Amino acid sequence: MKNLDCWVDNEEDIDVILKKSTILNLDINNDIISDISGFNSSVITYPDAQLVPGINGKAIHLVNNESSEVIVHKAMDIEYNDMFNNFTVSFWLRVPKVSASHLEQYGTNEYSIISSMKKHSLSIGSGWSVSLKGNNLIWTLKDSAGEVRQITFRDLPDKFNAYLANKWVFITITNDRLSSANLYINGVLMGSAEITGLGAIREDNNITLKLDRCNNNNQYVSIDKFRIFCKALNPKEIEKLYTSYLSITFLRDFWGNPLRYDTEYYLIPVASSSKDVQLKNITDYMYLTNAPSYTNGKLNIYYRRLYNGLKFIIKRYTPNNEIDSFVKSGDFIKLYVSYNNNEHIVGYPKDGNAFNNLDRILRVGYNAPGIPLYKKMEAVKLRDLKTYSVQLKLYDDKNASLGLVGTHNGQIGNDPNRDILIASNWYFNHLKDKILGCDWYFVPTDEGWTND
């Protein structure tokens, strides 16, 4: 009694604790990476460290060459924080899905992506490192006397739900030198290691962000919001820290990147993610089908395959907002299906067929003469902030709500029974359910996911 957390005083307001215990905090402003903690550690950016969209602005993109790195030179006042005392490392991480091929080829090649490690004699290294090995995420802590402690996290086999499978995920690693190290992903505890009794950790004066010892020349990773705390955060501090970055400003695609205009997306319903969207016929309705899947018992990985089903495109309802291409919640849009190299608008015909005069059946490319076709939508995010999904609100042409886009299981004509896309206001009265049929993933083609 005894506490190796840095002293704050403020033991109440979580936000005050998070702020006060921050000793390093990378931000990207006007395309320059710097430390905004207040300790002013210097940050050197090498020529092939690239910038990409991030969870809230831009983020760091590392490729596999020696010019692709970011080095933080620790300020003198924070230099020895982890020698004996507690600390927390946090950052957003995006790693592409490893191919079956590359798991076999490179699966035993452990490579670092962030490190303070130092080499000392006796063969001894000292510091901490974040590294990857196949679909393992690994935290290593080493003291100056040769002790080594580690957490090895094995990712989920279902790569649609896995953390090292091309989505932005939030990492947090807490170190309490009087108990354990704990690894969290998206605020949830994934692994722990006891770390008591360690000696002095004598690490590098620099913290290096770079792929180290990676044998796959085409490998890359992205890192955002890299931050270090002089405290071992508790689960409630971690939850607030995690949710604090979920900016309400832009909507997000399936991978966590900002949603964009003029971009092909495949839709998948969150509440039935094994399904793809199909079209009966131009001018007619859409429905769900089962996605085909990939399975590999040898390598223990599997996943519903992506990029089957219709391609959708979002356009501004009222053109020319020049430079920006990002969709903001509350934006008014037109939804198209691109088919036969033609774009076909999505909407509901006045008095069109509906189920129980209340679930409105959507039509693609409808064009009956003299029949209004309602197609003005609002792209919104009403629920589940941790989930990268979107809702779509359809209006008539008089500001009345025709409902959120969803599905309805039923039959049209003598067709087979199907989950058919619809707009319904029924969803507004149920926005608090765990799972809801109006939640959609927007999935664009991405080099970080190829089907095997």
Binding site for Au ion (CB under 5 A): 214, 216, 219, 391, 436, 438-439
Residue type, 304: R
Q: Min. distance of Cβ 106 from Au ion in angstroms?
A: 5
Closest to Au ion by CB, 3 vs 273, is: 273
Q: Min. distance of Cβ 25 from Au ion in angstroms?
A: 28
Closest to Au ion by CB, 192 vs 216, is: 216
Q: Min. distance of Cβ 287 from Au ion in angstroms?
A: 19
Closest to Au ion by CB, 21 vs 219, is: 219
Closest to Au ion by CB, 359 vs 439, is: 439
Closest to Au ion by CB, 53 vs 437, is: 437
Closest to Au ion by CB, 183 vs 436, is: 436
Beta-bridged to residue 45, according to DSSP, are 70
Closest to Au ion by CB, 215 vs 247, is: 215
Closest to Au ion by CB, 283 vs 450, is: 450
> Are 118 and 109 contacting, i.e. CB atoms less than 8 angstroms apart?
no
Q: Min. distance of Cβ 111 from Au ion in angstroms?
A: 5
Helices then strands, counting H and E runs in the chain, come out as 3, 34
**Three-class SS of residue 190?**
strand
> Are 51 and 58 contacting, i.e. CB atoms less than 8 angstroms apart?
yes
Residue 264 has a CB neighbour count (10 Å cut-off) of 16
Q: Min. distance of Cβ 216 from Au ion in angstroms?
A: 4
> Are 168 and 224 contacting, i.e. CB atoms less than 8 angstroms apart?
yes
Residues 6+ apart with CB under 8 A from 102: 216
Nearest Cα to 221, choosing from 169, 178, 269?
A: 169
Q: Min. distance of Cβ 64 from Au ion in angstroms?
A: 7
CA-based Rg of the chain, rounded to a whole angstrom?
Answer: 25
Please report the DSSP string for 33-102 in residue order: EEE-SSS--EEEE-TT-EEEE-SSSEEEEEESSTT--EEEE--GGGTTTTTTS-EEEEEEEE-PPPPHHH
Closest to Au ion by CB, 133 vs 316, is: 133
Strands (E), 205-355: 206-212, 220-229, 265-269, 275-279, 286-290, 293-296, 301-304, 311-316, 331-339, 342-349, 354-355
Q: Min. distance of Cβ 125 from Au ion in angstroms?
A: 20
Q: Min. distance of Cβ 383 from Au ion in angstroms?
A: 6
Q: Min. distance of Cβ 425 from Au ion in angstroms?
A: 12
**Three-class SS of residue 383?**
coil
